[PDB]
């Protein structure tokens, strides 16, 4: 019962560019994230993702994007 799942928040960077950059790269690297401003900085989040290696990687990969402060947020409403 439930795999496990997730819906990343790769926290909001100062970097503009690297915020409006993460996010097509974040999809370019292969973890397609969704950007949105809200905690001052943009902050990044990806479809409600499975837990299993896909979210954590999206962190490890979410260094591929160039970005600081992120975390993968789990569902559960």
Do not use: Y
């Amino acid at each position: 019962k439930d795999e496990r799942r997730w819906m990343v928040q790769c926290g909001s960077f100062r970097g503009a560019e690297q915020a409006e950059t993460v996010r097509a790269q974040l999809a370019f690297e292969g973890f397609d994230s969704k950007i949105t401003t809200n905690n001052g900085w943009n902050r990044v989040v990806i479809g409600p993702v499975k837990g299993k290696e896909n979210a954590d990687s999206t962190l490890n990969r979410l260094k591929m994007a160039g970005h600081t402060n992120c975390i993968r947020l789990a569902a559960g409403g």
